[PDB]
Amino acid sequence: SSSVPSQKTYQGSYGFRLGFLHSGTAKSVTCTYSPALNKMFCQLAKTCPVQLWVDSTPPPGTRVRAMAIYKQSQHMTEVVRRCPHHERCSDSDGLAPPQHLIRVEGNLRVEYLDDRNTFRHSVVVPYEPPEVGSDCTTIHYNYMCNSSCMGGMNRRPILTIITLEDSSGNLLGRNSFEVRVCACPGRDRRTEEENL
Amino acid sequence: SVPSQKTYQGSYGFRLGFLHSGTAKSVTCTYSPALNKMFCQLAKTCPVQLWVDSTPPPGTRVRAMAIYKQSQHMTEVVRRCPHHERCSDSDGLAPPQHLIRVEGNLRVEYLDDRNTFRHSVVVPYEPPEVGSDCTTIHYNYMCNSSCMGGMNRRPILTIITLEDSSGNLLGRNSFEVRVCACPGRDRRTEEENL
Amino acid sequence: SSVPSQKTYQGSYGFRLGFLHSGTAKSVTCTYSPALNKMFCQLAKTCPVQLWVDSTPPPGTRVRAMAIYKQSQHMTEVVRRCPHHERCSDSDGLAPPQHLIRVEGNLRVEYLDDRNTFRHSVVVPYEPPEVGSDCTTIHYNYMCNSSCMGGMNRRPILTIITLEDSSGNLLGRNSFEVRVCACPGRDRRTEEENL
DNA sequence: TTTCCTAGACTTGCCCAATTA
DNA sequence: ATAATTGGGCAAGTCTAGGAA
Ligand SMILES: [Zn+2]
Ligand SMILES: [Zn+2]
Ligand SMILES: [Zn+2]
């Protein structure tokens, strides 16, 4: 079938695991993750921290890349991108390309790719060790379009694929989580878990 | 211009074969002998077998192209719907406007005829391997038949054309195709139909 | 011309017109009524016309189409698109915006405008029927609804299809009525019923 | 001559639930 | 448990006949 980006979990030689903040579902939450759903709920354009767990430190030049792909097989060949309303928004942080759904916050070494071959979008940052006195590395992502954006994701489930790659682009590890960009993360999360 | 869906089992005796898929609900690809219709899912493998009576010369290429089955619509270049085209992906070769792609063939070529604009994918004709009887080409349909803005629910014909390095028609065949979710349930049904 | 003749003349080549076969469905964009010898269709769509012949007209031959009002009282007036429709429909670099009738799918179209009669025509080159075919098909588009106030204004038109030579001398001639509308099928179904 | 409707019955993707191995 | 595959069914969306202003 038409090839699509790989999404299988691979801890790699460095024991790469992804972590998240345990925010709860109170009405004030801006980003909340559901361990039972392996799903992150976040608000549009707000901080979403993502934790990198490693058992041994990766080599130097190590990069961390994120990519969104549709969860369903029937839509996997579709490149996740912002709806037209959104790409057209003046919401540029000056670094990200207007069509990318995923941005990286507060990292001037942030890099964006428009795959020449697959048309696929992604954001990379250099991998940093955990801030001394720290257990893991944190990355602040932002999702720039809502799940409900007709014309975009349109209510379809998206996965965020986090890849650990050497300076040459080789795969060192991969992990993933589902994401839902919506107005009320606490409410939505509670509910979807309410279903189980 | 415009292209024919006229069989030309030619001087080589060109014929197409299809696998025996089964009718589960949602089978990936399935062909209906009675209907002469392929029923497949978007982006899934659509195997099409090439059978000749005699090996064609070298330079021979295989071409696929779609057309609307219906009279009026035959003039409308068949292509991907706006949405899918906009959010298209690719494999390093396939252009975003093409509906039909060829899977696993680093030698594939994609054409958008400058004088018809008509789109097509052509691969070299490879004689079957020693001990084989036919040669398979795997195709993928990038939009469902019901893609509003595209297929808009209208029937298409896939026309395979054997041709020489020159571009001369050496052979011709066709099949209709229905890209849908659930090719299984839909073939039964359209059979129940008779 | 001031009002070209619309008389049928198969002439030396056994020139005939053919038409597709669809019923009165709403989903039927274009439809020909043999009884009414009228063709209904809807704005901007495909109108397939079958060019039958008994004798193969020589290379260079041409097929010109022209619309004329049907009523005598309207005959001398040129059929043109309304001013509205005229300020947009110009897609397909060959078709001038005023022309009501266009042909699609032919690199060689040639638009006319009698400089002395102002009548608009779409010319094409005669072409033999497809290898295993018994007729050549032309794809016609009718650029305005017969409704266009300021355009056809509910007035019936006739399309005269002529076979001519490189010089433009007439060879054969047919014609038929066209009703550009809203979901054509019914109109025929009905047009055929008062009958 | 268009424009509304009123539904009903399909068309058709995709949910969910059972079920395989 | 655990993922993949499947079949039941559904409901958003389509076009219908059809009468009406
Ligand atoms: Zn959006
Ligand atoms: Zn599509
Ligand atoms: Zn008009």
Q: Are strands A39-42 and A171-181 parallel, antiparallel or unpaired?
A: parallel
DSSP classification of residue C78? P
DSSP classification of residue B183? H
B127-132's contacts with Cβ under 8 Å and 24+ in sequence apart are B127/B55
Q: How far apart are CA C108 and CA B158, in angstroms?
A: 27
Neighbour-count burial for B127-145, b at 16+ CB within 10 Å, e otherwise: eeeeeeeebebbbbbbbbb
* Contact residues, chain C, for B73 at CB < 8 Å: 46
Q: How far apart are CA A121 and CA A117, in angstroms?
A: 11
For the beta carbon of residue A101, count every other beta carbon within 10 angstroms: 28
Q: How far apart are CA A1 and CA C179, in angstroms?
A: 48
Beta-bridge mates of residue C156: none
The residue of C20, C46, C102, C131 whose CB has the most chain B CBs within 10 angstroms, and thus the best one to mutate to test that interface, is C46
Task: Give the type of residue at A37.
Answer: L
Per the structure block, which two tokens stand in for B36?
């002469």
Q: How far apart are CA C6 and CA C181, in angstroms?
A: 23
Query: Are B71 and C45 an interchain contact pair (Cβ–Cβ within 8 Å)?
Result: no
**Helix or strand holding residue C129 (H, E):** none
Q: Are strands C120-125 and C110-113 parallel, antiparallel or unpaired?
A: antiparallel
Q: How far apart are CA C14 and CA C16, in angstroms?
A: 6
Q: Are strands C170-181 and C38-42 parallel, antiparallel or unpaired?
A: parallel
Query: Are B1 and C139 an interchain contact pair (Cβ–Cβ within 8 Å)?
Result: no
Beta-bridge mates of residue A161: A67, A176
Interface B-C, measured as beta-carbon pairs within 8 A, has a size of 25
In sequence order, what are the residues at sequence separation of 6 or more whose Cβ sits closer than 8 angstroms to the Cβ of residue A95?
A103, A108, A110, A112
CA angle A74, A80, A81 (to 5 degrees): 145
Taking the centre of ligand 2 as the mean of its atom positions, its distance from the CA of residue A105, in whole angstroms, is: 34
The phi and psi torsions of B33 (rounded to 5 degrees) equal -50, -45
Which technique was used to obtain these atomic coordinates? X-ray
Q: How far apart are CA C3 and CA C77, in angstroms?
A: 8
* Whole-number CA gyration radius for chain A: 16
The phi and psi torsions of B68 (rounded to 5 degrees) equal -70, 140
Ligand nearest the Cα atom of residue A181: 1
Query: Are C107 and B1 an interchain contact pair (Cβ–Cβ within 8 Å)?
Result: yes
For the beta carbon of residue B185, count every other beta carbon within 10 angstroms: 16
Q: What is the 3-state secondary structure (H, E, C) of B34-101?
A: CCCEEEECCCCCEEEEEECCCCCCCCCEEEEEEEECCCHHHHCCCCCCHHHHHCCCCCCCCCCCCCEE
Residue with tokens 């030309």, as numbered in its chain: B8
Domains of chain A in sequence order: 1-196 (2.60.40.720)
Query: Are B87 and A78 an interchain contact pair (Cβ–Cβ within 8 Å)?
Result: yes
Strand E and B148 CB separated by under 7 Å:
yes
Ligand nearest the Cα atom of residue C144: 3
Q: How far apart are CA B38 and CA B129, in angstroms?
A: 26
Furthest CA-CA distance within chain B: 46
User: Interface of chain B against chain C, CB under 8 Å?
Assistant: 1-2, 4, 6, 71-73, 75-76, 115
- Tell me the binding residues of B: 81, 84, 143, 147
- Shortest CA distance to C44 belongs to which of C194, C188, C180? C180
Q: Are strands C47-52 and C16-18 parallel, antiparallel or unpaired?
A: antiparallel
Q: How far apart are CA A155 and CA A160, in angstroms?
A: 15
Alpha carbon distances (Å) from A11 to A16, A35, A122, A189, C83:
5, 18, 20, 27, 69
Query: Are B101 and A2 an interchain contact pair (Cβ–Cβ within 8 Å)?
Result: yes
For the beta carbon of residue A19, count every other beta carbon within 10 angstroms: 16
Identify nearest nucleotide to residue C186 by CA to C1′ distance: E17
Which three-class secondary structure state does DSSP give residue A88? coil
To the nearest whole Å, the CA of B115 is away from the closest chain C CA by: 7
* Whole-number CA gyration radius for chain C: 16
CA angle A175, A176, A180 (to 5 degrees): 160
Taking the centre of ligand 2 as the mean of its atom positions, its distance from the CA of residue B158, in whole angstroms, is: 17
For the beta carbon of residue B166, count every other beta carbon within 10 angstroms: 10
Per the structure block, which two tokens stand in for A76?
């996997």
Per the structure block, which two tokens stand in for A157?
């489930």
